Symmetry: D3
Subunit: 133 residues, 6 copies
Amino acid sequence: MSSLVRRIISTAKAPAAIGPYSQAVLVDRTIYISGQLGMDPASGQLVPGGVVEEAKQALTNIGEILKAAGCDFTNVVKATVLLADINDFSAVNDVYKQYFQSSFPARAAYQVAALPKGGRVEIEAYAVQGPLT
Amino acid sequence: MSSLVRRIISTAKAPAAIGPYSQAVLVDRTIYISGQLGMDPASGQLVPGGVVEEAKQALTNIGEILKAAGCDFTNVVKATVLLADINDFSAVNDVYKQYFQSSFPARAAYQVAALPKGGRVEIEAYAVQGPLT
Amino acid sequence: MSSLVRRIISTAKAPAAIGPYSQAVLVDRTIYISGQLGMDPASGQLVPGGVVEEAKQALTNIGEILKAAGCDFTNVVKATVLLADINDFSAVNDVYKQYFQSSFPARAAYQVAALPKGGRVEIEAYAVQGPLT
Amino acid sequence: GSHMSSLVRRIISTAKAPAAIGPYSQAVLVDRTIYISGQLGMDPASGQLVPGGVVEEAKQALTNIGEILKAAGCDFTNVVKATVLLADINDFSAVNDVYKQYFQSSFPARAAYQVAALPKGGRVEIEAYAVQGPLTTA
Amino acid sequence: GSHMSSLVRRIISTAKAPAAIGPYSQAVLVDRTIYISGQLGMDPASGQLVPGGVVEEAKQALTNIGEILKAAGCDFTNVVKATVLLADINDFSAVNDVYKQYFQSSFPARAAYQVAALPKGGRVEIEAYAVQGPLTTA
Amino acid sequence: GSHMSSLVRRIISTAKAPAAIGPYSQAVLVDRTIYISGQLGMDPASGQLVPGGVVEEAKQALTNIGEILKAAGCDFTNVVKATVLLADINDFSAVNDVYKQYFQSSFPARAAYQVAALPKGGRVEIEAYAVQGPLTTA
Ligand code: NI
Ligand code: NI
Ligand code: NI
């Protein structure tokens, strides 16, 4: 069968791996993006200011990974929003909405027991390289 | 490269979005379905009767989204079952089994800390548009 | 449209299903693998020794499912690591690292409230059948 | 035999073009490519060449191709290659004046040359390849 | 050169059909499409035309195509287009009586016409295109 | 018309090969397959056959194909089928001696035969099919 493209996505505009994973993997046309915490890309540290600031940084991180793969947020087809606190759902929703102009992805969003580094939010995503009709 | 089909799936036979997401996204042949709670499609409210009733409604909701995309449960390849209580695993399993006549999907099933709206169960799914061999 | 290959993956070298799911589903070239606990394939029981032993068994289980589908760990593109305890992240990371020689998958890793059978870890994965470039 | 996708193979058949009598089809669509049998200036109803020589024949042949394309959900914009077979190379310019009426832009690849003889005494035969849309032209 | 999938390109080669001597292959499979070099009524063992004229030649040519299809994991049901080249248009009916024996249904697209000359003095040459299965016929 | 992928269809055009004047393109790339119009031994600059007979013409024709392949991001290793049309079957060996210079291994499928006449009085015309890489040869 055809040999499908498989490319590790890696940019210094997103945080370095603090464990055994790639930022994202592009395979054929689908990009599987690792869960992103609200880590400042230069320092590798959670940004201050709690869940809202962290959500903004996490989504910014995803945006830079998408850009490295020739995509933007319009390429995203599914996301998962992992919360440390379900009471933050409204606040996180309002952040998240700002990163999608259109064609809102499929999503699941819920509270887990704990995230790495005591993050308040982690977002994973799936995207498909364009062109998309 | 080819421009792949990307279609937002939306039916009034499933609940309206109470946040910034689509019910499902079809991209090429893969359908990414949002996490469904046991919400009555007409009202947008959780059905009464607890985890069993909610699981039935959530899976019914998924079925209507699949139908909107020209599919049924035989198109589903993976599901995730998110529980508010791991003690409900048996009861939810017996509900879930009724929606698959065959070719049971891959699955993961476990307890999270909280779901939106105080749901007792949420189910996400991945499907592939047929024909399938 | 073309009729895509859809094959239920099933091997006696991985645990039997204790519920209504397949070990994995191959659909076109993508393999959706069910969440694996650290269950001994012969007995269906969690191996003793806690999170480290369980992680090793879970990943071994995934390896046998990949082998049944003509793949190995280099085919994996995404994994999710579900922990019963976020303090086990380091220990689980060191186990997990041993199963990837290269091209580390995308990943998300975090603590949930409870796993089936009181497992300490569950790992799901997504793979793509080769050849991969 | 089941480890790769099963690709669509559709037999095209329309009463609006000469019937394909014997062990051939008017066209075969397979995956997205349509292979169209060479068409002569044969009248579908009569089973004979239309009168009036190479120009009338070219018109009927291209009409025939058009009806086959339509049966496959396509039109002339789907054509990516055509071969124009002639009884006389010196009829090329006159056949080209017919042919150019069917194409606007993004023209098919083409070969045109003279053969020793065509079926039915034909003076022109056109074979085409097309690709089922949608197509994005660059 | 690495940003798109690398498609399979397989050279077909079988001792059961005339050897392809010089810078050509008996057939090339690329992705799922098999392009088969035109086959004459050449005996594989002798390297010459079989005796007995156009009918014997057509049988050998189609036998040759069959062995090449088999080498590519296919049979005659995989064929989607064929071209029948003749030394004499008036041999069409007799060659067609041979050809029809190889196909049952879902027939290939076809063109048949007379050329000025074929290699080796041949009276018939058949070129075919096939698509590696599985195929779903509609 | 939007429920299947929209496949790329690219018109190939290069000044380095004879211009395609009238309702045809030098080549069409569609999905990954390139259909290349038959090329004569025509000088691009002059619009006429090069002098010196069939051997000089074959060289120019293959040079023409080369420039078209290059315009489509390909070279001769991308070619999967070619057809060699001749004014004289007895020129096959001499044209083959030219042709073999363009191919090293993994040769295209081929048909070669004599036609009654080619455009422009040509003695050789070559049509080719190619597939945009990357390609994995087995
Ligand atoms: Ni198969
Ligand atoms: Ni490339
Ligand atoms: Ni469409």
